[model samples]
Target: GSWNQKLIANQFNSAIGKIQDSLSSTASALGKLQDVVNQNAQALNTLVKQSGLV
Candidate 1:
């Protein structure tokens, strides 16, 4: 019946929305990780400066 199909479609849309949300969350997670990496790079740069070797 058309009602059954509508129900399935709604379920599918909800699942897709959930996945998209997770994907966005995952991107945000990676952005934080990249920021940490940037901080490490900055630390290393300062370390070299402090070492007075360059």
Candidate 2:
């Protein structure tokens, strides 16, 4: 019946929305990790400069 088809379509849309939300969250986490790495590298450079190594 058409009602059954509508119910399936609604479920499919809900599932797709959840997947999109998860992907967005993962991307945000990766961005934060990248920032932490950059900060660490900068700190190391500061230490090297203080030591007069480069």
Candidate 3:
């Protein structure tokens, strides 16, 4: 149970780190971007809280 959460956190955090880097990569409109950002926002929050890295 210990390393499992740590492993998941590490993987999740890494994915989020990369995903965030691509946040401003699109050359399109903000209409759908806002929605997607909000979507990842919740997932990011949960992952951050899970690791208590805030």
Candidate 4:
């Protein structure tokens, strides 16, 4: 019974570690995406003004 309990706990701990790693990676990607989007928005705004569209 004790061995089974240890095995179950180990499985959960491994799963939690993987989830934490994925979350860290995802957050970094999102930060880069936000930077790109912001730059694009600024460029588009400049183009629009130069063309007298707004």
Candidate 5:
């Protein structure tokens, strides 16, 4: 459970970092980056849930 949570959290953090990078270095790409991050997070959540850690 802890490992799965950490994996999900780390992937989410990576997405956030990508957002920050896009915002800071490519402000015009912010919308796309947001979408990408959202998708990544959703996928991570799906994977985490599938792990049956609960």
Candidate 6:
């Protein structure tokens, strides 16, 4: 069956949208921050990548 947005609780619609938007915002900020940090990291870059930080 198709996903039913109507079946969800009234508040869940707005709340889920807000939550997803917040996650998108944070991820975008983190990406920019990561690029800045990557420029300065020599050894830490490899370690961070190995640790799955990126």
Candidate 5, residues 1-54, lDDT tens digits: the string is 699987998899899998898778776567678999999999989998999685
Question: Global lDDT of each model?
Answer: 0.95, 0.94, 0.81, 0.94, 0.86, 0.82
What value of lDDT does candidate 1 attain over all alpha carbons? Answer: 0.95
C-alpha-based local distance difference test score of model 6: 0.82
Model 4 RMSD vs true structure? 1.8
TM-score of each prediction: 0.69, 0.69, 0.36, 0.71, 0.40, 0.56
Residue-level lDDT of model 1, residues 1-54, one tens digit each, is 699898998899999999999999999999999999999999999999999679
Candidate 3 regions exceeding 4 Å error are 27-54
Which portions of model 1 miss their true places by more than 4 Å?
A: 50-54
Q: What's the number of clashes in each of the models?
A: 0, 0, 0, 0, 0, 0
Candidate 3: give the clashing pairs. Answer: none
Best by TM-score: 4
Instruction: Kindly provide the TM-score of model 1 when superposed on the true structure, using C-alpha atoms.
Output: 0.69
TM-score, candidate number 5: 0.40
For lDDT, candidate 3 versus 4, the one ahead is: 4
Estimate the TM-score for candidate 2. Answer: 0.69
Q: Which candidate would rank higher by TM-score, 1 or 4? A: 4
Query: Which tens-of-lDDT digit does each residue in 6-50 have in candidate 4?
Result: 899989999999999999999999999999999999998999998
lDDT of 1 at 11: 93
Candidate 1 residue 23 Cα shift, in angstroms, is 1.6
RMSD of 5: 21.5
Compared with the true structure, the alpha-carbon lDDT of candidate 2 equals 0.94
Off by over 4 Å in 5: 1-28
Predictions ranked by TM-score, top down? Answer: 4, 1, 2, 6, 5, 3
